[PDB]
Amino acid sequence: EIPTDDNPNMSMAEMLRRDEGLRLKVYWDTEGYPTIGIGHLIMKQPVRDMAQINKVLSKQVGREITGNPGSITMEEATTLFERDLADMQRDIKSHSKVGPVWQAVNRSRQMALENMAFQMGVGGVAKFNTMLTAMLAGDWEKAYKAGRDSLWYQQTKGRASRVTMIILTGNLESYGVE
Amino acid sequence: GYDKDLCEWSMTADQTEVETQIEADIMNIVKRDRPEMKAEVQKQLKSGGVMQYNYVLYCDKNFNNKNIIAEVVGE
Ligand SMILES: [Cl-]
Ligand code: NA
Ligand code: NA
Ligand code: NA
């Protein structure tokens, strides 16, 4: 059948630079939230006032942010990403719905779930009840179908397509990883 | 793809200007390769966003930009 990849040659940094992009100045996501770096949410409010955004970002980065739009360095983007990744990876493992699935599946399928959690939060992934139930049962076709039967798939179809392919196959060929 | 100037600019310039450029580059590839997908690609840029594609398009020589259509729409 289709081979699984239990040790895929791709990091989450690589996967998320690809899916989230890379900004060194503030931009706003599709919900209107100020963002920078590799999907780093600065505030979970649709604030456009750059003086306010920069004051918050300064605390997060550790030095005074200047400019409009506010600017960071690549090192700072990396530091923000490492922390965001660490937070997500801890929480995806412990959450009582997503966590048991993460523990049960191979590293490729874990990366799929981690990718979703970086996009929508661990709580957002937990809403995929049918998908997660199917994954825990090893019913990959049902999990794939459930993942695509979602607002996530309709709104961010490219990303959801390549992520759900990982769930189906257990490899990262949909990200170009042989 | 990697283009030194567009990588730096896309990471740093005004969002609206950057998104206009990303969208133009994507739509040029669509028109060249799979013109029947124009409206579908536009729908997904609207629903899913534009800025995220800067890295693969401009900052990564390992990504072949012909693959941006599938990147956006999933096929
Ligand atoms: Cl505001
Ligand atoms: Na790092
Ligand atoms: Na992990
Ligand atoms: Na560059």
Author numbering:
A (entry chain A): 165 to 342
B (entry chain C): 23 to 97
Question: Could you share sentences copied from the article?
Answer:
Here, we describe the structure and function of gp61.3 and show that gp61.3 inhibits the lysozyme activity of gp5 but not that of T4L. In 2002, we determined the crystal structure of gp5 that showed that gp5 consists of three domains: an N-terminal OB-fold (Oligonucleotide/Oligosaccharide-Binding fold, gp5OB-fold, residues 1–129), a lysozyme domain (gp5Lys, residues 174–339), and a needle-like C-terminal β-helical domain (gp5β, residues 389–575). We hypothesized that the mature form of Spackle/gp61.3 (residues 23–97) functions in the periplasm to selectively inhibit the activity of gp5, possibly by direct interaction. Combining all our results with previous work on gene sp and 5 mutants, we propose that the main function of the Spackle protein gp61.3 is to inhibit “free” copies of gp5 that are not incorporated into the virion during T4 particle assembly and thus can escape into the periplasm.
To understand the interaction between gp61.3 and gp5Lys, we crystallized the complex of gp61.3 and gp5Lys obtained (Lane 5), solved its crystal structure by Molecular Replacement and refined it to a resolution of 1.15 Å. The complex consists of one molecule of gp61.3 and one molecule of gp5Lys. The interface between gp5 and gp61.3 contains 10 hydrogen bonds and 8 salt bridges. The buried surface area is 1733.1 Å2. The two jaw-like subdomains of gp5Lys are further away from each in the gp61.3-gp5 complex compared to that in the gp5 trimer. Therefore, gp61.3 inhibits gp5Lys allosterically by stabilizing one conformation in the gp5Lys catalytic cycle, thus breaking it. Gly322 fits against the C-terminus of helix 5 of gp61.3 (which forms the C-terminus of the protein) so that it leaves no space for a side chain.
